[PDB]
Design an enzyme around this catalytic site. Structure first.
Site, PDB file in Angstrom:
ATOM      1  N   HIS A 261      36.926  37.912  69.373  1.00 14.15           N
ATOM      2  CA  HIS A 261      37.448  37.460  70.652  1.00 14.15           C
ATOM      3  C   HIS A 261      37.381  35.945  70.745  1.00 14.15           C
ATOM      4  O   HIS A 261      36.616  35.287  70.035  1.00 14.15           O
ATOM      5  CB  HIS A 261      36.710  38.115  71.832  1.00 14.15           C
ATOM      6  CG  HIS A 261      35.348  37.550  72.098  1.00 14.15           C
ATOM      7  ND1 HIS A 261      34.911  37.233  73.367  1.00 14.15           N
ATOM      8  CD2 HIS A 261      34.318  37.271  71.266  1.00 14.15           C
ATOM      9  CE1 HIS A 261      33.675  36.772  73.303  1.00 14.15           C
ATOM     10  NE2 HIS A 261      33.291  36.785  72.039  1.00 14.15           N
TER      11      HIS A 261
ATOM     12  N   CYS B 207      32.099  30.922  73.548  1.00 12.72           N
ATOM     13  CA  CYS B 207      31.054  31.919  73.207  1.00 12.72           C
ATOM     14  C   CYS B 207      30.481  31.631  71.852  1.00 12.72           C
ATOM     15  O   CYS B 207      31.223  31.179  70.954  1.00 12.72           O
ATOM     16  CB  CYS B 207      31.640  33.324  73.248  1.00 12.72           C
ATOM     17  SG  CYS B 207      30.501  34.426  72.484  1.00 12.72           S
TER      18      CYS B 207
ATOM     19  N   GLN C 290      31.054  44.661  78.689  1.00 16.16           N
ATOM     20  CA  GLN C 290      31.504  44.738  80.072  1.00 16.16           C
ATOM     21  C   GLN C 290      32.774  45.575  80.146  1.00 16.16           C
ATOM     22  O   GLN C 290      33.599  45.551  79.232  1.00 16.16           O
ATOM     23  CB  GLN C 290      31.747  43.340  80.642  1.00 16.16           C
ATOM     24  CG  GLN C 290      30.479  42.511  80.812  1.00 16.16           C
ATOM     25  CD  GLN C 290      30.748  41.019  80.793  1.00 16.16           C
ATOM     26  OE1 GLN C 290      31.280  40.485  79.822  1.00 16.16           O
ATOM     27  NE2 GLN C 290      30.375  40.337  81.868  1.00 16.16           N
TER      28      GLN C 290
ATOM     29  N   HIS D 151      39.179  36.451  78.153  1.00 15.29           N
ATOM     30  CA  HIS D 151      39.134  36.707  76.719  1.00 15.29           C
ATOM     31  C   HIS D 151      40.519  36.990  76.154  1.00 15.29           C
ATOM     32  O   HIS D 151      41.377  37.572  76.823  1.00 15.29           O
ATOM     33  CB  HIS D 151      38.251  37.917  76.376  1.00 15.29           C
ATOM     34  CG  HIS D 151      36.875  37.869  76.958  1.00 15.29           C
ATOM     35  ND1 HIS D 151      35.761  37.568  76.204  1.00 15.29           N
ATOM     36  CD2 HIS D 151      36.424  38.122  78.209  1.00 15.29           C
ATOM     37  CE1 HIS D 151      34.686  37.620  76.969  1.00 15.29           C
ATOM     38  NE2 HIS D 151      35.061  37.951  78.192  1.00 15.29           N
TER      39      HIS D 151
END
Lengths: 4, 150
Positions: free
Chosen positions: B46, B100, B118, B144
């Site tokens: 991602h 991230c 999530q 994302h």
């Protein structure tokens, strides 16, 4: 940081 | 007829037909297909773009993430367009720009099952087929782009  | 999440749409701007997945938010011109369910596990990379309203508005790229949600979405949409054009590669963009720590793995998060990420990230990841890339996926962490690698 996509963790539950 | 179409795989889960996929619907045939028409642009309000254009008059052009395209295909949209309501679960992954992916868009494409190509028809997505010419008791299987969903995979019990997937591997995904991602690219995350955080904004001022992210849960932790901070990353290795900047302590104080100050961009708005709309600006983060515009960045995400730009990366998607660069990947689709062939101008840029997904893993390369994730290494450079993902907010991230998985950027150091070129976006790779490894394999996971349901109940671990999530819910919006998980829903999109398990609706992707292998090799497919999501549209913008909104979570508490930010926005994302997701690439299913396995």
């Amino acid at each position: 940081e996509x963790a539950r | 007829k179409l795989p889960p999440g996929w619907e045939k749409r028409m642009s309000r701007s254009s008059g052009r037909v395209y295909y949209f997945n309501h679960i992954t938010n992916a868009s494409q011109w190509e028809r997505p297909s010419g008791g299987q369910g969903e995979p019990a596990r997937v591997r995904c990379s991602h690219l995350l773009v955080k904004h001022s309203q992210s849960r932790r508005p901070s990353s290795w790229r900047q302590e104080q993430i100050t961009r708005t949600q709309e600006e983060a979405l515009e960045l995400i949409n730009g990366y998607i367009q660069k990947i689709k054009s062939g101008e840029e590669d997904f893993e390369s963009l994730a290494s450079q720009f993902s907010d991230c720590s998985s950027a150091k793995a070129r976006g790779d998060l490894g394999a996971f099952s349901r109940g671990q990420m999530q819910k919006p990230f998980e829903d999109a990841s398990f609706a992707l087929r292998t090799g497919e890339m999501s549209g913008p996926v909104f979570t508490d962490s930010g926005i994302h782009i997701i690439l299913r690698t396995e």
